[PDB]
A paper describes a structure:
The I-BAR domain protein [name] is a key player in these processes, acting as a hub that integrates signaling cues from Rho-GTPases and phosphorylation pathways to initiate cytoskeleton and membrane remodeling events. In the inactive state, the SH3 domain binds intramolecularly to the CRIB-PR domain, resulting in a compact, closed conformation. Here, we show that phosphorylation of two pairs of sites within this region triggers the binding of 14-3-3 to [name], which inhibits membrane binding and the interactions of Cdc42 with the CRIB-PR domain and cytoskeletal effectors with the SH3 domain. In all the structures, the phosphate group on the phosphorylated side chain engages a cluster of basic residues in 14-3-3θ, consisting of K49, R56, and R127, and additionally forms a hydrogen bond with the hydroxyl group of Y128.
Therefore, to study the binding of 14-3-3θ to the pT340/pT360 and pT340/pS366 pairs, we determined five crystal structures, allowing for direct comparisons of the structures of singly- vs. doubly-phosphorylated complexes. All the singly-phosphorylated peptides, except Site 1 (pS325), bound 14-3-3θ with ~1:1 stoichiometry (i.e., two peptides per 14-3-3θ dimer) and relatively low affinities (Kd ranging from 5.5 to 16.5 μM). For the singly-phosphorylated peptides, the electron density is symmetric for the two pockets of 14-3-3θ, even when two-fold symmetry was not imposed during refinement. In contrast, the Site 4 peptide has an alanine residue at the second position after the phosphorylation site (pS366), and follows a relatively straight path along the groove of 14-3-3θ. The exception is AMPK and AMPK-related kinases, which studies using chemical genetics screening have conclusively implicated in direct phosphorylation of [name] at S36635,41,42. Furthermore, one of these studies linked the phosphorylation of this site to the binding of 14-3-3, with concomitant loss of cell polarity and cell spreading in Madin–Darby canine kidney (MDCK) cells.
Author numbering:
A (entry chain D): 363 to 368
B (entry chain B): 1 to 230
C (entry chain A): 2 to 230
D (entry chain C): 363 to 369
């Protein structure tokens, strides 16, 4: 899965 | 409840990981109509990010079980109905966030930084809607997400430094949109790569705190770059 | 509608939607039929997860309250938030205890199920005790201890020391002694007795039972290490 | 904190 901003 | 008490209670809820309450507090704060501070923007975003991420993960689980169930199985109907319930909750959350963005946050933003932050948020939550959209609705939802992302992207390229954490995180989430929604890994890769490269050029001019904030996002960019190119 | 409720409970479990799971298993329980091991475990998982969030939130909020100056004007809001969380927790515990007294303990046919349910009663009265004060605290402690003691006697009489339900009962009862009654010595002795007596017959358990019982024994040893230092 | 059963 791609990492978005958290 | 007044703004000071709402922020106090939002932070208290955050500590308790009671993100529904935190979101309620920051929703009232936003609806009071004043421009949010960076801290208040961050609190709102954290609250709703967790509130929606719960439904997102549950939806992934249920839809994975569904797409692995025989279409003739009598159990499939219950699985589909449960997915639809989670989907309705997710849609409701995203709709609340987008209403806050249109009616208050974007409308009252007085500087390009806040406008980029909020347009990125709009892209984010339209993208969350697109993750679960099917049919004609999907096309318009994707278009809305992309339009928000693109406007934020242009504004940030015009008004902000390539190391600004908001610009970098916008680049990250936009590349994710390209990879996961538009299913175009090449453009997602080039987007993340361009953001990263244009950032390293300027990193050394920052203090160690801004360096930290930028380095984190740049590391996320490079992580996605490595994943997508394999 | 039992089968659909169970399917939906397991689905909600996988999605970590524990309110839905608790509602499903609450409906299954209220149907009057005695639960199977799987169904007991589903109900327990559901309500454990529903109440654990409140318990952790309460610990955090109360901690922040202790560190807050008594003359700080902001204190009353912290108190009100803690009381809100406490009210939610009391509601959950009352729902579970009603399920236990009205359906589960009443229709429990074998001593294994009776031990399981009396232990659950002890657990949820213990959760009430964690947040209680004054007379309410005394009454909840007495209820918890009575449930634990009856379960403990039945387990000593009817079940082998290796049975994971008896071991988990010993674990939770030792936790009760340490955290509620505040007697670390008797808590240690209870945990250590259950642990030691379990070692012998370990070679008789099956796969799932062995895994569960050794997990509980590891928790017993962890508590023993923590308490004695 | 003490550990109770994973129940
Ligand atoms: Mg349906
Ligand atoms: Mg109270």
């Amino acid at each position: 899965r791609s990492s978005s901003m958290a | 409840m007044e703004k000071t008490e709402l922020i106090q209670k939002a932070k208290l809820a955050e500590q308790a990981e009671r993100y529904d309450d935190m979101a309620t507090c920051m929703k009232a704060v936003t609806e009071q109509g004043a421009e949010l501070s960076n801290e208040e923007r961050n609190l709102l975003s954290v609250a709703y990010k967790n509130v929606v991420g719960g439904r997102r993960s549950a939806w992934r689980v249920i839809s994975s079980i569904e797409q692995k169930t025989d279409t003739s199985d009598k159990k499939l109907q219950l699985i589909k109905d449960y997915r639809e319930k989670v989907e309705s909750e997710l849609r409701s959350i995203c709709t609340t966030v987008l209403e806050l963005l249109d009616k208050y946050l974007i409308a009252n933003a007085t500087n390009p930084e806040s406008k980029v932050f909020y347009l990125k948020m709009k892209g984010d939550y339209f993208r969350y809607l697109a993750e679960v959209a099917c049919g004609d609705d999907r096309k318009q939802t994707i278009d809305n997400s992309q339009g928000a992302y693109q406007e934020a992207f242009d504004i940030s390229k015009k008004e902000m430094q390539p190391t600004h954490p908001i610009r970098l995180g916008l680049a990250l989430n936009f590349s994710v949109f390209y990879y996961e929604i538009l299913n175009n890994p090449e453009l997602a890769c080039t987007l993340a790569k361009t953001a990263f490269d244009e950032a390293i050029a300027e990193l050394d001019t920052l203090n160690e705190d801004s360096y930290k904030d930028s380095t984190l996002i740049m590391q996320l960019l490079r992580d996605n770059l490595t994943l997508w190119t394999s």
